[PDB]
């Protein structure tokens, strides 16, 4: 008589079988984490962390392992590129294998709790019916969670007894796992300050322990117990679902806008770094500093790191992919091989021309060369349009500085047109489109996919909060009402 | 005028059933030190050696566990490098920083005249001041008026609004039996901890040898 | 129902079903903590939004 969408409500009044299905879900989730990491370790290429990082290869669980301090592998390599001798058990493979062993043990524990459902612990001594004292259970679980929250902040993050967390510079070129001192001032509320992570978990953990002491000692008010239906297991389901989508909306914005918990060396750059020219402005700032030192343009642009130039490329923008463009970022433009250098375009009048950069909105953007005033000087016309300001007519030459083509000058129109198209996407790079049979359409980073999954999951969990919230407050009439 | 009349009005009312009726209160861990995992773990049956001989062992476990808890905290503080400011002995030119934080290192470097003052304070506490009363509970050696944190049954705690809750002896984390049990268990764990830190130091020079 | 060693241990932790504080209890304290939490959440939102510019904290990527 139970419909298909109500089959799991047999567990609603069975605390022993409720632990069993929760242990089974734990076994599947821990099993997924070990399996996802093992599959990811099979397809990971750790050869070049500069132009082929984890986020270019579609690594999903690997950035979260590296964020908390797991950077070495049993194969002798590390995420930073430095060859490691002995990582111990807590390598990438050891973390993956432990989640598999934990999955099997939870699977066996789920079987025991399913079979031995009728425990005296779940029975109310006054009535003999199955009962769960939910306010007391909340105090136990809040105390246990706050102990873990405090211990994670005080020992793991601060490095007192722990590895620390991933920290980097403002441009993501020197990233490493390092102990982080807590920031107790107003700077701890800067989301990009990693010191806030340590100070939050210590402060919130302490307050949660104090709240756990209160919730383990003081019983709920009678009027609050009746209003919130605290004797019903569905009222905590509705409230936990609400807290769950509340967190998922925050972690979606934190991932999308960037924070200290989502570094660009693990998840890739954000779309707002390309919008504001974040890496571009720093690149010209370092070049202009070298020019004032007396270096020529060739050597000034040669000091620019390839990692910094790779960030200033629209193919690394997470807002450039597609919903059904599956696979890694290397499946798109290709696997990055070498920075080609910075092209400088010039007409026959010595005017320095800059290609107008492509906004993330446009799938295709017109190729336009403008001077320092802002007037359009050269063009790449649309297909067979009647050209008047074309590259051939204007006569634009291109000089490359830095990279592989350092010092080279290209003046023939087909190569100038080809590099003007590549200059529209930011820094010019050479790509291996044959290893993965890359098709040339841009894909999204792990930063883009996480936000899509968790903002959509949070939206769907808002619906579940309304449904399970209504089922709690209307439990008496949910089989129907009386005829009047 | 007695200054305690506001306490009764700030006192929270007795907890009831949700329906409205009075709550029905509705096991084998009666003695302090008898805890859920092992219960009464008495392999040698010291409880069967006599009530006088068993009363001796309760005070003996309490005293041994109390020094071991202080001893463990002392080594963990000094081996970490935490020191008092100034001099330990201005006559011997002994700064606090010069003395090793290790157990054997601190035991030898502290002067014997300084060690005598520690021992005599313990002797003064053991023989006159903090003497065990046979009528009093085991381990209750602090006399009245020596400003000790006590948790009697029904003692008052205070909430955010100023309301007052009375804490029974069986309350979690706040009752007397919880704190009495936690003193005994942390004393038992530090008892094994301090002798383990001694032998790991004897073998490697590191009291916490795997760590560090 | 089955009695286990762990079930006997955890038995007092699930023995207070239906026990409530009479009347409004500590709802007034809870409302104050909820109101303080609401103000705190608005503060860290407006800091991230740059609607509150503090003294020398800058919402931008930091070094070290």
């Amino acid at each position: 008589a139970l419909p298909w969408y109500r089959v799991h409500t047999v567990v609603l009044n069975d605390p022993g079988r409720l632990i069993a299905v929760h242990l089974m879900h734990t076994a599947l989730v821990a099993g997924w984490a070990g399996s996802m990491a093992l599959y990811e370790l099979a397809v990971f290429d750790p050869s070049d962390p500069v132009l082929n990082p984890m986020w270019r290869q579609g690594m999903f669980v690997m950035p979260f392992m590296a964020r908390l301090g797991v950077t070495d592998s049993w194969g002798g390599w590390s995420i930073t590129g430095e060859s490691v001798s002995n990582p111990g058990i807590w390598s990438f493979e050891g973390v993956a294998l432990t989640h598999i062993v934990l999955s099997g043990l939870c699977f066996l524990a789920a079987i025991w709790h399913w079979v031995y459902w009728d425990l005296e612990l779940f029975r109310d001594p006054r009535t003999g019916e199955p009962a769960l004292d939910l306010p007391k259970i909340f105090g136990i679980h809040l105390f246990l969670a706050s102990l873990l929250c405090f211990g994670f902040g005080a020992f793991h993050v601060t490095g007192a007894f722990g590895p620390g967390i991933w920290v980097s510079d403002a441009y993501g070129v020197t990233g490493r796992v390092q102990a982080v001192a807590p920031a107790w001032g107003p700077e701890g509320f800067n989301p990009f300050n990693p010191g806030g992570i340590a100070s939050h978990h210590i402060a919130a953990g302490i307050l949660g322990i104090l709240a756990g002491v209160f919730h383990l000692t003081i019983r709920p008010p009678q009027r609050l117990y009746r209003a919130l239906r605290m004797g019903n297991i569905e009222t905590v389901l509705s409230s936990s679902i609400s807290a769950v989508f509340f967190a998922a909306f925050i972690t979606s914005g934190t991932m999308w806008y960037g924070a200290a918990t989502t570094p660009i060396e693990l998840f890739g750059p954000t779309r707002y770094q390309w919008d504001s020219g974040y890496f571009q402005q720093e690149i010209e700032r370092r070049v202009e500093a070298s020019i004032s030192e007396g270096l020529s343009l060739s050597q000034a642009w040669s000091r620019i790191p390839d990692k910094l130039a790779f960030y200033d490329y629209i193919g690394n923008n997470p807002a450039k992919g597609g919903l059904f463009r599956a696979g890694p970022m290397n499946k798109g433009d290709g696997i990055a091989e070498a920075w080609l250098g910075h092209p400088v375009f010039q007409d026959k009048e010595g005017r320095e021309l800059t290609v107008r950069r492509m906004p993330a909105f446009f799938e295709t953007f017109p190729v336009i060369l403008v001077d320092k005033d802002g007037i359009v000087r050269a063009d790449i016309p649309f297909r067979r349009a009647e050209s008047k300001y074309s590259i051939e007519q204007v006569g634009v030459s291109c000089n490359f500085y830095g990279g592989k083509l350092n010092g080279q000058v290209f003046t023939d129109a087909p190569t100038v047109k080809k590099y003007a198209r590549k200059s529209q996407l930011g820094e010019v790079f050479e790509f291996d489109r044959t290893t993965l049979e890359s098709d040339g359409v841009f894909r999204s980073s792990p930063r883009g996919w996480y936000t899509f999954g968790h903002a959509n999951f949070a939206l769907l969990f808002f619906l579940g909060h309304l449904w399970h919230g209504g089922r709690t407050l209307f439990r008496d009439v949910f089989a129907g009402i009386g005829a009047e | 005028a007695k200054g305690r009349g506001w306490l009764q009005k700030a006192r929270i009312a007795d907890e009831i059933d949700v329906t409205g009726s009075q709550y029905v209160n509705v096991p084998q861990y009666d003695e302090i030190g008898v805890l859920p995992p092992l219960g009464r773990w008495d392999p040698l049956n010291i409880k069967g050696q006599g009530e006088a001989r068993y009363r001796r062992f309760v005070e003996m476990e309490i005293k041994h566990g109390r020094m071991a808890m202080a001893a463990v905290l002392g080594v963990l503080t000094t081996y970490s490098g935490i020191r008092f400011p100034g001099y330990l002995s201005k006559t011997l030119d002994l700064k606090f920083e010069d003395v090793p934080g290790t157990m054997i290192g601190s035991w030898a470097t502290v002067p014997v005249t300084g060690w005598i003052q520690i021992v005599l304070f313990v002797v003064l506490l053991e023989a006159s001041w903090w003497k065990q009363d046979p009528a009093k509970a085991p381990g209750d050696v602090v006399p009245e008026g020596v400003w000790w944190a006590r948790y009697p049954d029904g003692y008052s705690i205070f909430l955010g609004d100023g309301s007052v809750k009375t804490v029974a002896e069986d309350e979690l984390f706040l009752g007397k039996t919880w704190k009495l049990n936690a003193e005994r268990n942390n004393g038992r764990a530090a008892m094994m901890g301090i002798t383990g830190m001694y032998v790991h130091e004897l073998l490697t020079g590191n009291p916490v040898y795997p760590l560090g | 129902a089955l009695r286990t060693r762990l079930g006997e241990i955890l038995r007092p932790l699930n023995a207070e079903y239906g026990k409530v504080a009479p009347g409004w209890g500590t709802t007034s304290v809870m409302g104050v903590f909820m109101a303080l939490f609401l103000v705190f959440l608005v503060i860290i939102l407006q800091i991230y939004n740059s609607s509150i510019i503090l003294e020398n904290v800058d919402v931008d990527w930091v070094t070290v």
Partner: peptide
């Protein structure tokens, strides 16, 4: 990296402690 934070000591002692407590609580009462 191996040998940091006690090496394999704490995971071995921790896993042995969990296994011993499960075996201690596995027997029926009375």
């Amino acid at each position: 990296n191996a040998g940091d934070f006690g090496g394999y000591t704490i995971p071995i002692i921790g896993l042995g402690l969990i296994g011993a407590t499960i075996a201690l609580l596995a027997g029926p009462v009375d």
